Amino acid sequence: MEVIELNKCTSGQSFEVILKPPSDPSLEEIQKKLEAAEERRKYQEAELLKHLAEKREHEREV
Amino acid sequence: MYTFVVRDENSSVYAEVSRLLLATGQWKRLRKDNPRFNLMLGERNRLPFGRLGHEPGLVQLVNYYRGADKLCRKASLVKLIKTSPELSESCTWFPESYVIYPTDEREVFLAAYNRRREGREGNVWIALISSEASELLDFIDEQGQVHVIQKYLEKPLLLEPGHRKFDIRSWVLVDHLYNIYLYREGVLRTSSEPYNSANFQDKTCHLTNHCIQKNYGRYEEGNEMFFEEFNQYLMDALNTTLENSILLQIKHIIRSCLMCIEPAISTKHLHYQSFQLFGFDFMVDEELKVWLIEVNGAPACAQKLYAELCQGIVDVAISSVFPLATSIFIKLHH
Amino acid sequence: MRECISIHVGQAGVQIGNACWELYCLEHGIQPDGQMPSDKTIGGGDDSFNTFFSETGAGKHVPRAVFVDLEPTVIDEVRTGTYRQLFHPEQLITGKEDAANNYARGHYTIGKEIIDLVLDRIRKLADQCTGLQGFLVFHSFGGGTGSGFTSLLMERLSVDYGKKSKLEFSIYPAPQVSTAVVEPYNSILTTHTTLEHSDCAFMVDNEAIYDICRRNLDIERPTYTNLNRLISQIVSSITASLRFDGALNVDLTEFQTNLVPYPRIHFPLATYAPVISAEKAYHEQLSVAEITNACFEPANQMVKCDPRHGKYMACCLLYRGDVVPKDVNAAIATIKTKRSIQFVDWCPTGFKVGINYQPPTVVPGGDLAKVQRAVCMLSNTTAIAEAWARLDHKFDLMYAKRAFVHWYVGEGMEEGEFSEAREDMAALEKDYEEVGV
Amino acid sequence: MREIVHIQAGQCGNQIGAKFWEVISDEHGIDPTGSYHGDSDLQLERINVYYNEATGNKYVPRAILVDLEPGTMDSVRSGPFGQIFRPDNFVFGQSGAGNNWAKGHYTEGAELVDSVLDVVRKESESCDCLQGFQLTHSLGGGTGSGMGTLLISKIREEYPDRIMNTFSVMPSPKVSDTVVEPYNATLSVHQLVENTDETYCIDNEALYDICFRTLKLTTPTYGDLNHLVSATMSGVTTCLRFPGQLNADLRKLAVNMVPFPRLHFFMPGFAPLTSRGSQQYRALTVPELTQQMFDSKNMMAACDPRHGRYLTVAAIFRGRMSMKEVDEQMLNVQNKNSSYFVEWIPNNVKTAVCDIPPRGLKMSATFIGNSTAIQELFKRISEQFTAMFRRKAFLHWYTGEGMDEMEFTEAESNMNDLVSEYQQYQDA
Ligand SMILES: Nc1nc2c(ncn2[C@@H]2O[C@H](COP(=O)(O)OP(=O)(O)OP(=O)(O)O)[C@@H](O)[C@H]2O)c(=O)[nH]1
Ligand SMILES: Nc1ncnc2c1ncn2[C@@H]1O[C@H](COP(=O)(O)OP(=O)(O)CP(=O)(O)O)[C@@H](O)[C@H]1O
Ligand SMILES: Nc1nc2c(ncn2[C@@H]2O[C@H](COP(=O)(O)OP(=O)(O)O)[C@@H](O)[C@H]2O)c(=O)[nH]1
Ligand SMILES: COc1ccc(CCc2cc(OC)c(OC)c(OC)c2)cc1O
Ligand SMILES: [Ca+2]
Ligand SMILES: [Mg+2]
Ligand SMILES: [Mg+2]
């Protein structure tokens, strides 16, 4: 019902119509989490290379 | 094939509906959590309406209308009738009602209860039944559940022989097109003990539920009188018909209620579709006026009518959207 | 004048960026080589379009944009496309092997290796800014880059530019044009990590856009090009207030002020009308009342949901074309009496309206018809939570068996992040339920 | 990730491998000399995935040919497309493995594996971004089976972050070289379960039944069997070789196909099924393709799909057809048989279309299914394995090469575990 704060210009116009009234982590913490994940990757790949190392030992033994 | 799921096990109505669908040989049932269904017979409460209509290659239909609870909850049914201009406060077919919370419309209710005392006229109300307001207010705060205070119909129509009270139950099926189909078979849920004008604690002759009664079965089987007999009684006893004296008002009330909420619940342009079966409970006073008491969103049928009604639900609501290979319903036009 | 930097991440963001900047160039009269004859102040200025374009001494208008992808296939088509001369080579950043639809791979494994390079190229544009106010970030929820790298970028921008507003345009995953079965995983993970770092986010469900293309543009099987040209129209509507003269939504902070009263509930629903096919030989132009009423049909929303069963917290109407306030208020009065529009009790029932007289521009030979007037409604309704419920249920179904979780752990992510992200989503859904019912 | 390194080992591996290079070379328009005489640029847009570009406009397959027996390798160089292969990439021994897994893996193959790894390293170094490896091999002999898995273990040591894909032909008594094949396959499956990301289980039982029952070939040869393999191999690599909306690669396939690392054994399928020479004149309709590719009669692994559930499915249609109709037909099948797809993986069926049809067909469809019914194959191998192992029969061939009975018991139990892991998700 009530039209307010109407502004006009060559491009167009804007306004507001009211129908009824009412009633961050740091840089350090990021770089630490990104590198905790890389450590978890290194460990998993180290475990793989250790398992593959055991397999090579077995291949020599056979 | 078509596919459907069953997520309300306690539903006797749709236990029969799913059984009939299987018997066609063209409907396969799935597990609760399988999402690739054409039809859902969903759960009574917290039904996941936000997950419907997002299956590519599947037209999805459900047996409930989101938002229909505003008609099927006593507290919200009162709010809807008082606040909707289409219904008004001067609504002539709904008893005076007031929302009361256990801790709101308690100052509004007691101010009109004085007009009933200063005029000294009939001043009985229902929530249990009492003639004094503060008697059951002690019992409203006693439960901690939002109760509705309603003026009780002191002068009801009484069937003879028996001088009994009753309530009329009507079954209304609204389809995806929002056509309103009134099942032609109603039921009178009758009292077996005579109506006492001053035995409010005696609940058997005042509350006409099928559970309270079960003199039960004396006058008719299961305290259920169907329309063939009630129409004949009105002809003989009052020189009128069921259609003229009562049924015109019932169809007006059903049409009015369901038109009021149609913009809020209609699935005309939705990504999923809805239908729903409703049970309307009506009262008849002695001057042959029909009053609306409550609307049931999850109604149970009467034993004799299950077969015919459930076939109709499949006919007009389900196969209307998923075809295959007289009507029992009265279309309430609008 | 205060500049805005656009960041386009992954395939979806890059390709949508192309559609947007193509549209911007047509709208502002900028040619594919960057010349803008209507700009009489050569080599500089503080006009409204300078919020999105810087100027060279030779008169080139260059987008304040950075494109980032972990693989070079998509950005290469920018490097060689019709608008190749528009951008500076340092704004197009590519790796060689993408995130393989893996949020963890984009965030941790590959993201960590390229994040510093991107922030340096972003810093290059910020140094060209006299008043940088914030960024517009375009990305998919589903891709490994769109989800994983964006969240890493968003967390860093908060550190390097804590004082700057960040807006998102997010492509919500849909099975119809989906890329991966794990897209629900990437969506919840990226939403959880980005939530504190975004001030306002406009989700676009690929399902909604797909159906709009089928239903209104008469396109059997829409392509990304079909979808992107339509998305770019909505983005252009949402950003027009930053690029043109006007009183409403003139700075990024105003999007938060006007659309987001609660910080976590910062996902406004966009609804756009009319969408009309170019092939349609006979058309009856739609009035202000008809297009404004169209803003309340779910079939026109960017996300399919039912606003009638939610509550509104803010509502803006952005018109373009032949529209005057008198006709808008007449449409609003009619719509108010006939539709279910409930606001929360602690917010006023009112529409903020902006009108741009220039009607929407359409790409020559595109699928959208020219229209005399169009409108984009931005409403913050709890109903958009339906999309979170849909997404969270799919997440729950797979995660109960821990399906595919091993691909993420394998990249250095802990299984606990899945449940942390999901619990945050559980909190978000509870937030919407309070405000909404 | 663009470049794939191809390795084919032993007789079966090299023959199906050579047939593969014949087929996709024709599709990409490359002649036996290595020159492009095609017409569409789509043939060249992703030709680098499988071909190195050579001096003088010549395309050289990124293929390493390995055998312990010089025989089949001479058959390749003298074969139709044998000239195209890089000569330095032929790596052969002299004695052969004698259908002995232990000789391929531990004694004879170990002597030659380093020379293969040098050729692998030389091809990898020419790679802009190597995405992974594919191996063709049988599991029933000794070279492709025993040495093939030895290479795979070695490649994982040197390229632990690259994808390992195999096309593994399964032994069958209906097409049987020797009685020890269940031993070689059970030992190889033990390796494949740990050291590959994706294994296409090409079952000689299915290839024979297709030739006998469906194609009406009363006494089918390996040539008839390999016609089915090369068509399937062409189909499952379509998305890697051609420009698509998807822009697919081996890693995205593994991510989306494999919900649990060990359950990565795919059941492939093809439609329409055609025998050699006898051409097709009646093109199939989209509904016919969809029905056939999901039919057990078109499965390349002898397993009944209705005895399990699909965890994930990938389907690639080739030819000029309605992509809308493909979408409606795929949605049709999943919706009419939803009980055979797991309900806890939403949207687990993915579909792609490629404009370019294969030679001799105008419409074709390749099926890649990760089904729990694949356990029927492993149970078939396990029963034949146990039938002999309970009497330690034929084991001396292996203990003579240094193997212990314990190594047989372990391989047996791991394959039984794989079997029970599949059953776990069939009922879930
Ligand atoms: N609307 C629209 N959506 C797209 C487009 N491209 C990709 N998507 C969506 O993005 C999701 C997949 O994420 P992508 O952006 O393609 O992948 P990415 O960001 O490059 O990350 P990677 O997985 O490493 O490639 C899918 O759900 C697609 O629907 C596009 O051009 N337009
Ligand atoms: N205002 C009123 N005046 C007269 N009788 C009333 C009344 N309100 C309720 N009643 C009686 O009380 C009985 C039960 O009322 P109500 O309909 O609230 O119970 P209910 O909801 O358990 C029945 P249903 O099984 O349909 O759900 C009705 O049969 C009716 O006869
Ligand atoms: N489909 C198919 N299977 C083969 C072919 N050659 C051998 N096989 C199968 O592979 C097994 C023998 O392995 P083989 O390749 O000869 O041993 P290798 O040369 O030492 O690797 C047997 O079970 C055969 O059925 C072939 O050309 N096609
Ligand atoms: C549900 O399963 C999915 C599976 C595969 C993908 C993407 C990868 C992908 C799809 C292919 O389409 C068939 C394909 O072709 C064989 C391919 O080959 C490299 C790779 C997405 C999924 O969502
Ligand atoms: Ca200027
Ligand atoms: Mg990508
Ligand atoms: Mg042999």
Side-chain angles (χ1 to χ4, degrees), chain A, chain B residues 1-87 89-105 107-116 118-144 146 149-198 200-334, chain C residues 1-89 91-220 222-284 286-437, chain D residues 1 3-244 246-278 281-319 321-361 364-378 380-428:
Chain A
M1 286 194 59
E2 187 187 22
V3 173
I4 76 167
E5 274 172 24
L6 162 87
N7 184 264
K8 301 178 66 181
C9 70
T10 293
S11 287
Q13 44 186 317
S14 57
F15 61 94
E16 174 175 354
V17 55
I18 302 181
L19 298 178
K20 167 192 175 62
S23 305
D24 289 15
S26 65
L27 182 94
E28 178 192 51
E29 302 175 1
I30 284 177
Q31 279 303 118
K32 280 183 287 188
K33 285 207 193 179
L34 266 61
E35 291 169 342
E38 195 186 25
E39 295 285 81
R40 279 182 297 270
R41 283 195 311 282
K42 318 252 195 191
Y43 174 71
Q44 296 161 0
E45 188 185 295
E47 290 285 275
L48 167 75
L49 300 194
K50 190 161 304 176
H51 178 89
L52 295 182
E54 300 177 277
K55 167 159 177 44
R56 305 284 175 265
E57 201 190 280
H58 179 70
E59 296 164 8
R60 288 198 161 292
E61 285 171 18
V62 166
Chain B
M1 303 285 292
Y2 303 114
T3 51
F4 72 92
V5 303
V6 171
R7 300 165 60 92
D8 183 285
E9 288 280 297
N10 310 346
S11 181
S12 50
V13 185
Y14 293 98
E16 173 69 3
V17 188
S18 58
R19 263 192 291 273
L20 311 187
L21 290 152
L22 303 159
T24 306
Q26 312 188 39
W27 282 88
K28 180 184 174 183
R29 179 171 173 173
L30 316 176
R31 203 48 267 156
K32 300 162 47 54
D33 291 41
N34 186 332
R36 298 178 151 285
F37 57 85
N38 289 111
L39 162 61
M40 160 170 175
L41 315 183
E43 58 265 53
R44 268 187 56 165
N45 183 274
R46 279 209 171 267
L47 190 160
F49 287 100
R51 301 211 294 265
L52 302 175
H54 300 271
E55 284 306 339
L58 279 179
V59 181
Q60 293 186 320
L61 179 74
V62 61
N63 65 333
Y64 277 95
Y65 263 96
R66 198 179 180 188
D69 46 325
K70 289 186 185 306
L71 203 75
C72 301
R73 294 284 207 277
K74 296 196 173 59
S76 54
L77 171 57
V78 168
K79 175 191 183 304
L80 180 65
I81 288 170
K82 285 180 173 57
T83 44
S84 299
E86 294 93 278
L87 297 206
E89 152 58 341
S90 183
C91 179
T92 77
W93 40 261
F94 194 59
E96 212 161 334
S97 305
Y98 299 92
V99 163
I100 286 303
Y101 284 116
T103 356
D104 183 57
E105 270 185 349
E107 188 178 306
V108 188
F109 151 72
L110 291 162
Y113 176 46
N114 288 315
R115 323 293 295 108
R116 287 249 178 269
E118 304 310 306
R120 296 203 296 100
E121 293 301 357
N123 209 336
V124 185
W125 302 78
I126 185 173
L128 274 63
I129 313 166
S130 174
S131 190
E132 298 273 320
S134 52
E135 282 191 15
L136 284 176
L137 287 169
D138 276 331
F139 280 76
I140 284 173
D141 307 334
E142 205 298 313
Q143 290 258 59
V146 186
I149 253 343
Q150 176 155 71
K151 157 64 156 68
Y152 175 97
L153 290 144
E154 295 169 44
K155 297 199 168 204
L157 191 77
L158 300 188
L159 300 96
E160 313 295 356
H163 222 66
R164 350 191 222 138
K165 196 213 206 129
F166 85 156
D167 72 55
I168 301 183
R169 161 63 72 80
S170 297
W171 287 280
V172 178
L173 176 58
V174 188
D175 66 14
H176 64 281
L177 308 166
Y178 214 95
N179 294 332
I180 292 161
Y181 293 112
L182 170 70
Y183 185 28
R184 70 187 173 191
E185 313 286 354
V187 74
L188 279 58
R189 310 136 101 197
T190 75
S191 183
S192 74
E193 277 78 29
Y195 176 88
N196 198 286
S197 146
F200 287 159
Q201 320 312 38
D202 204 333
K203 290 188 282 189
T204 44
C205 78
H206 280 67
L207 280 53
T208 49
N209 303 72
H210 191 285
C211 67
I212 298 166
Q213 311 288 296
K214 192 173 183 176
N215 289 287
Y216 167 77
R218 172 158 154 81
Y219 308 93
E220 60 280 335
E221 192 188 325
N223 273 28
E224 292 180 0
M225 185 190 312
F226 300 154
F227 280 177
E228 185 72 339
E229 185 182 344
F230 186 47
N231 182 67
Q232 198 81 63
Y233 166 84
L234 288 168
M235 292 189 131
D236 310 325
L238 278 54
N239 197 25
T240 183
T241 70
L242 177 46
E243 176 77 43
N244 292 20
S245 60
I246 283 175
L247 209 38
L248 274 182
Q249 292 166 87
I250 286 181
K251 291 180 294 183
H252 170 79
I253 296 188
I254 296 171
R255 215 188 277 98
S256 300
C257 281
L258 289 176
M259 294 322 159
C260 184
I261 57 175
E262 171 165 8
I265 73 183
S266 184
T267 69
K268 181 177 180 179
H269 306 133
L270 259 194
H271 37 277
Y272 73 84
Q273 306 275 59
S274 292
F275 71 92
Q276 187 173 344
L277 179 70
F278 294 92
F280 286 81
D281 292 347
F282 299 99
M283 271 283 302
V284 187
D285 67 16
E286 53 177 28
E287 186 58 354
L288 286 193
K289 176 183 188 121
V290 175
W291 300 84
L292 176 67
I293 292 310
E294 78 159 6
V295 191
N296 296 112
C301 189
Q303 191 62 221
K304 169 182 154 191
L305 289 314
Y306 265 96
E308 197 189 35
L309 174 59
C310 285
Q311 174 57 34
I313 304 185
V314 172
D315 273 353
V316 309
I318 298 186
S319 287
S320 189
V321 193
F322 310 112
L324 298 190
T326 49
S327 182
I328 63 172
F329 296 103
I330 319 160
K331 192 181 183 177
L332 302 182
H333 282 109
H334 54 276
Chain C
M1 175 276 273
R2 290 184 84 204
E3 303 93 343
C4 292
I5 295 166
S6 296
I7 307 166
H8 310 276
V9 180
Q11 176 170 301
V14 170
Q15 300 200 133
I16 287 155
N18 284 309
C20 292
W21 286 102
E22 172 182 27
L23 191 50
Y24 295 164
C25 288
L26 294 167
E27 276 176 30
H28 299 288
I30 299 163
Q31 290 162 8
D33 64 10
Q35 290 290 301
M36 201 194 183
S38 65
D39 182 7
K40 309 298 172 185
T41 55
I42 314 294
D46 57 334
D47 298 295
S48 282
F49 64 85
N50 289 127
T51 300
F52 278 58
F53 299 82
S54 63
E55 294 173 51
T56 69
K60 176 171 279 188
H61 297 76
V62 182
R64 299 181 199 277
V66 54
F67 289 63
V68 59
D69 205 359
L70 298 192
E71 66 111 345
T73 307
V74 180
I75 283 172
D76 281 340
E77 283 181 279
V78 181
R79 291 171 175 145
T80 61
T82 40
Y83 280 100
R84 63 189 172 279
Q85 307 175 71
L86 204 67
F87 314 91
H88 176 258
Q91 315 175 245
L92 311 177
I93 309 161
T94 53
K96 288 191 180 159
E97 87 175 307
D98 67 27
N101 305 155
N102 196 340
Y103 171 83
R105 191 172 174 86
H107 190 87
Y108 298 102
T109 306
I110 302 186
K112 172 179 180 303
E113 298 300 305
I114 203 170
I115 184 69
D116 287 343
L117 172 67
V118 163
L119 289 167
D120 179 81
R121 303 274 176 93
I122 288 172
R123 181 68 77 185
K124 296 303 181 172
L125 301 174
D127 287 349
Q128 291 173 4
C129 295
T130 61
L132 172 68
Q133 56 176 309
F135 319 86
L136 291 81
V137 189
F138 298 76
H139 67 99
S140 65
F141 276 173
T145 311
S147 69
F149 186 67
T150 297
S151 65
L152 177 62
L153 181 65
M154 291 293 275
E155 289 189 316
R156 219 77 130 46
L157 292 178
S158 289
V159 169
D160 289 18
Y161 302 86
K163 50 216 163 302
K164 274 67 176 182
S165 286
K166 298 194 270 309
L167 267 61
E168 289 180 282
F169 291 95
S170 304
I171 303 308
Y172 182 100
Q176 305 211 36
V177 284
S178 67
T179 290
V181 64
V182 296
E183 286 193 37
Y185 280 172
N186 301 334
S187 298
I188 282 83
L189 294 172
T190 194
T191 297
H192 162 65
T193 294
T194 301
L195 200 48
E196 300 177 19
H197 303 272
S198 190
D199 302 301
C200 186
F202 303 102
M203 287 191 283
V204 186
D205 193 338
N206 265 340
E207 182 191 76
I209 304 300
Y210 193 84
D211 277 349
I212 288 165
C213 283
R214 285 202 303 192
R215 179 186 344 110
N216 300 356
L217 290 175
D218 284 332
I219 297 172
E220 288 281 76
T223 66
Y224 283 144
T225 305
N226 303 129
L227 302 175
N228 287 344
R229 295 190 192 281
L230 175 60
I231 296 165
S232 67
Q233 294 290 336
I234 291 104
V235 173
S236 170
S237 293
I238 294 162
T239 61
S241 52
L242 302 172
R243 307 176 284 118
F244 296 100
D245 207 7
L248 176 64
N249 291 343
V250 283
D251 66 277
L252 300 181
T253 295
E254 195 168 329
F255 285 103
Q256 178 276 297
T257 292
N258 284 0
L259 290 170
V260 183
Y262 299 117
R264 277 165 70 81
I265 307 171
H266 62 242
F267 299 92
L269 178 64
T271 315
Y272 186 85
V275 175
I276 305 296
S277 164
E279 301 304 302
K280 189 177 179 189
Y282 178 68
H283 185 52
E284 287 178 358
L286 299 180
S287 65
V288 167
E290 288 167 324
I291 66 172
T292 308
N293 188 49
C295 287
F296 295 86
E297 298 299 348
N300 298 315
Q301 292 158 2
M302 296 306 102
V303 183
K304 288 175 166 192
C305 56
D306 201 333
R308 306 175 290 182
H309 301 99
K311 282 185 176 51
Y312 287 96
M313 294 162 276
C315 194
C316 295
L317 293 166
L318 309 174
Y319 297 88
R320 296 174 81 163
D322 175 57
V323 179
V324 297
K326 192 179 198 165
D327 295 319
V328 179
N329 296 323
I332 291 172
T334 301
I335 282 158
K336 177 58 192 187
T337 67
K338 282 192 173 183
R339 285 199 185 273
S340 298
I341 296 168
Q342 193 93 259
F343 272 74
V344 298
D345 297 331
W346 56 273
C347 293
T349 299
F351 298 77
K352 280 204 183 80
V353 179
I355 299 173
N356 209 284
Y357 290 149
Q358 181 204 263
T361 308
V362 285
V363 177
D367 312 287
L368 285 188
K370 288 208 219 69
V371 302
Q372 300 184 320
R373 57 199 64 81
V375 62
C376 181
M377 183 164 89
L378 306 172
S379 56
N380 191 353
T381 170
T382 59
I384 204 159
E386 290 175 44
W388 300 131
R390 288 181 25 239
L391 207 52
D392 287 337
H393 181 73
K394 293 181 184 187
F395 179 104
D396 288 342
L397 279 174
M398 300 198 239
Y399 190 74
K401 319 297 189 289
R402 301 292 192 276
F404 303 103
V405 169
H406 72 274
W407 292 111
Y408 296 72
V409 173
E411 298 288 358
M413 189 170 129
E414 303 174 281
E415 190 168 287
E417 177 163 6
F418 274 82
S419 50
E420 282 183 46
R422 182 64 182 88
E423 295 176 15
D424 198 11
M425 294 307 292
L428 189 59
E429 281 197 55
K430 259 167 289 170
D431 291 338
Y432 274 96
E433 251 249 305
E434 282 185 47
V435 191
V437 192
Chain D
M1 306 194 241
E3 288 106 358
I4 296 177
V5 167
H6 172 92
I7 304 155
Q8 58 198 40
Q11 183 172 291
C12 181
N14 275 275
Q15 290 182 346
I16 71 178
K19 191 78 188 304
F20 168 77
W21 287 104
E22 288 173 20
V23 176
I24 70 171
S25 297
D26 169 63
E27 278 178 29
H28 289 271
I30 319 297
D31 61 56
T33 74
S35 284
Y36 177 93
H37 277 273
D39 57 313
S40 175
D41 291 339
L42 289 181
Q43 301 175 290
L44 294 178
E45 188 165 339
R46 285 164 93 193
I47 196 178
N48 71 27
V49 170
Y50 283 102
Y51 295 81
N52 274 307
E53 202 166 340
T55 86
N57 306 308
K58 295 296 196 69
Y59 294 98
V60 183
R62 201 170 299 103
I64 301 156
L65 296 77
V66 176
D67 205 346
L68 281 176
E69 186 164 322
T72 305
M73 289 193 32
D74 293 328
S75 304
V76 171
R77 284 181 270 213
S78 64
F81 276 78
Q83 310 277 83
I84 194 173
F85 296 98
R86 168 169 159 83
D88 293 317
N89 288 26
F90 289 78
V91 187
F92 57 84
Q94 291 297 336
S95 55
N99 296 308
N100 194 322
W101 191 85
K103 291 191 187 174
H105 203 74
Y106 291 124
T107 57
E108 311 287 325
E111 207 171 327
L112 181 71
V113 73
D114 282 0
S115 303
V116 179
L117 295 176
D118 292 337
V119 185
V120 178
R121 194 154 325 96
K122 191 157 186 176
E123 291 286 356
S124 291
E125 277 158 10
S126 161
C127 288
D128 176 49
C129 192
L130 167 74
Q131 58 171 307
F133 309 93
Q134 61 176 47
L135 172 80
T136 56
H137 70 135
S138 59
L139 308 194
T143 303
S145 180
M147 193 195 177
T149 53
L150 181 71
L151 273 169
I152 286 167
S153 201
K154 290 283 166 44
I155 296 173
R156 199 184 183 185
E157 208 180 20
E158 197 168 328
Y159 310 85
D161 65 336
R162 293 291 91 105
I163 291 287
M164 176 55 68
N165 175 61
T166 71
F167 298 80
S168 305
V169 181
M170 300 301 177
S172 179
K174 291 175 188 171
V175 181
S176 179
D177 285 331
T178 45
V179 289
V180 290
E181 298 188 336
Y183 284 160
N184 299 339
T186 299
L187 294 169
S188 289
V189 163
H190 181 41
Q191 303 286 300
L192 295 182
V193 172
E194 296 296 332
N195 289 343
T196 69
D197 301 302
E198 302 153 347
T199 284
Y200 297 104
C201 298
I202 305 167
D203 191 359
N204 265 356
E205 247 223 19
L207 300 182
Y208 180 92
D209 293 341
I210 295 170
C211 289
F212 183 54
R213 301 164 168 169
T214 297
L215 304 200
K216 286 273 179 188
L217 296 168
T218 41
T219 67
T221 60
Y222 284 129
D224 300 324
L225 276 46
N226 298 344
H227 175 70
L228 301 180
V229 177
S230 72
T232 299
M233 287 198 293
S234 177
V236 306
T237 63
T238 297
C239 287
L240 305 169
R241 294 184 285 108
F242 287 106
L246 253 182
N247 196 268
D249 68 348
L250 290 164
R251 194 166 253 105
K252 271 139 147 213
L253 178 67
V255 173
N256 290 292
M257 289 298 295
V258 189
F260 305 100
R262 289 161 56 81
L263 314 180
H264 61 262
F265 294 88
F266 305 155
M267 174 179 321
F270 197 77
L273 297 164
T274 65
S275 49
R276 283 181 303 159
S278 323
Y281 298 128
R282 180 191 105 152
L284 263 62
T285 73
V286 175
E288 292 178 313
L289 281 171
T290 301
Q291 187 162 336
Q292 279 163 36
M293 85 187 324
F294 280 94
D295 186 15
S296 69
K297 290 177 200 318
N298 299 60
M299 294 308 162
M300 308 288 267
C303 310
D304 186 7
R306 282 172 181 265
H307 293 153
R309 298 180 80 206
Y310 290 110
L311 309 165
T312 55
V313 177
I316 172 60
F317 291 81
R318 296 189 74 175
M321 59 191 101
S322 183
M323 303 209 288
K324 186 196 177 187
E325 209 183 339
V326 175
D327 276 335
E328 311 193 321
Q329 283 312 307
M330 289 303 204
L331 293 174
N332 177 68
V333 161
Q334 324 171 39
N335 287 337
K336 313 258 209 128
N337 305 309
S338 60
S339 66
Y340 294 111
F341 298 82
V342 297
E343 81 268 27
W344 39 273
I345 295 181
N347 189 27
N348 59 353
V349 180
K350 187 81 167 73
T351 309
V353 184
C354 185
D355 293 319
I356 318 303
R359 190 174 188 91
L361 266 340
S364 97
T366 304
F367 176 88
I368 310 167
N370 191 348
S371 173
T372 71
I374 197 68
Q375 74 181 284
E376 297 189 334
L377 184 156
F378 295 122
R380 189 187 85 215
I381 305 289
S382 194
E383 283 156 5
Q384 297 163 1
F385 176 98
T386 303
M388 295 174 287
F389 191 70
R390 61 179 177 191
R391 310 288 292 262
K392 290 174 204 200
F394 297 102
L395 202 61
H396 66 91
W397 292 124
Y398 303 82
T399 53
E401 303 288 339
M403 285 184 68
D404 188 75
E405 280 182 10
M406 207 34 78
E407 170 142 17
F408 276 75
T409 307
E410 285 161 17
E412 189 196 43
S413 306
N414 195 29
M415 191 166 77
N416 283 344
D417 286 346
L418 182 66
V419 157
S420 53
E421 297 161 10
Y422 274 115
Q423 187 62 42
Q424 174 192 358
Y425 300 110
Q426 187 173 290
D427 301 319

